[PDB]
Amino acid sequence: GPESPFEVIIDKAAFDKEFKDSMKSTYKEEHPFEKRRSEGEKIRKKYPDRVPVIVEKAPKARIGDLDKKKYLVPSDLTVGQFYFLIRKRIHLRAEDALFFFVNNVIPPTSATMGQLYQEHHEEDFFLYIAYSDESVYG
Amino acid sequence: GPESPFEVIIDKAAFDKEFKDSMKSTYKEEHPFEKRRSEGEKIRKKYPDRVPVIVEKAPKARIGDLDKKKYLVPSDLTVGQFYFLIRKRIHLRAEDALFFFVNNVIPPTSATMGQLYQEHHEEDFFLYIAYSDESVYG
Amino acid sequence: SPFEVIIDKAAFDKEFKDSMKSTYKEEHPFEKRRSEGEKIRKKYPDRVPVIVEKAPKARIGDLDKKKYLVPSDLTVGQFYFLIRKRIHLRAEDALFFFVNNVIPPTSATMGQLYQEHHEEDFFLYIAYSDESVYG
């Protein structure tokens, strides 16, 4: 039996702070916060049944880029279904790898986009998803 | 200038319609809809604990075929545990990939078979699970 | 027999619940682990003790450290991300976690995983591999 020490791991709040901006977003860098928040707030009021989503390629990803970054997604569509739709947009074959990341974690396919947004949207009222052929963002 | 347009993505009902015919079943093609509705009802009324599931190889799949298509499964068992067992029955190698699909999406390992049935059963009271070496059905 | 009827929890757990190898279990006797598990849970009720070890067949680095004291509100996905960094895996490397031979969903909290699956020594055991099934 070990009196050897435990590795004392951080909790959710410390994780969230440690990795807050660890996923890059050219969208966040090219548009000032107040303008994003304004547009995000307005689109949620105009279409309450949909959520605004920014989808961008991870820097290390070896995979085609997306023609469009800004997605307005019905809240009852699951993550798995949105993934299937984005796969078609990249023109990936079914055997090809594709992974989604929200705050450095792959969300389960059964989550609705409405739940994902409600749980993880940023203060500008957008949800940020990065994608990669790798099973980790970085 | 004006705000960049969003890509307006389809919702769940439109997803379900656009990809309903995506998944083919030899068991559904060799067994009429009325016979399967009666059979699925009879087992489902006789066996409320267990759920009836058809497990079949995706057409483009490169996996070994199963000896048995029809399964009556204790609905408390999780899909992950069912998956473990089905892997055992294919005598699949640990280095080989295997995925389950319902309506072109992989179900979560923590779901009981009852939740998957009551959420995705067809009009014949049958749950349809496809398996493949591919991370997507098509 | 047209329908195939599959075996249940009693045989499942009797057959598999101790089936993943643990060098920790082999090197520390059950009585001392149970004592340490009980004590650490009463001392830090907001955390859960976790042993993380390589599956026998895995082609993957070993961990410098096995014993983790994990806040119960951290999700499995978050803990996975942290363990990946400790193994110093490259982004292109695959990594899978197994609890009782099943991959847990990333959204489960470590507190729930522990509650559902800890053993009688009051530790939760996770095995990892580059393969998508324990081996």
Author numbering:
A (entry chain A), B (entry chain C): 1 to 138
C (entry chain B): 4 to 138
Give verbatim excerpts from the published study on this entry.
The core of the AIM is composed of four amino-acid residues [W/F/Y]-X-X-[L/I/V]28. Thus, the C-terminal helix-assisted AIM/LIR is a unique structural basis commonly seen in the interactions of yeast Atg40 and these mammalian ER-phagy receptors with Atg8-family proteins.
We also determined the crystal structures of GABARAP (a mammalian Atg8 homologue) bound to AIM (LIR)-containing sequences from the mammalian ER-phagy receptors FAM134B, SEC62, and RTN3 (FAM134B450–468, SEC62361–376, and RTN3245–264). For the analysis of RTN3, which possesses six AIMs, we used the third AIM from the N terminus, because it is well conserved and especially important for RTN3 binding to mammalian Atg8-family proteins (mAtg8s). Remarkably, all the AIM-containing regions of the three ER-phagy receptors are structurally similar to that of Atg40, consisting of the core AIM and its C-terminal short helix. The core AIM residues of SEC62 (F363 and I366) and RTN3 (F248 and I251) interacted with GABARAP in a similar manner. The short helix of RTN3245–264 lacks an acidic residue and instead possesses hydrophobic residues (F257 and F261), which formed hydrophobic interactions with Phe62 and Ile63 of GABARAP. However, the Kd values were substantially larger than those for FAM134B and SEC62 peptides, and the interaction with LC3C was not detected.
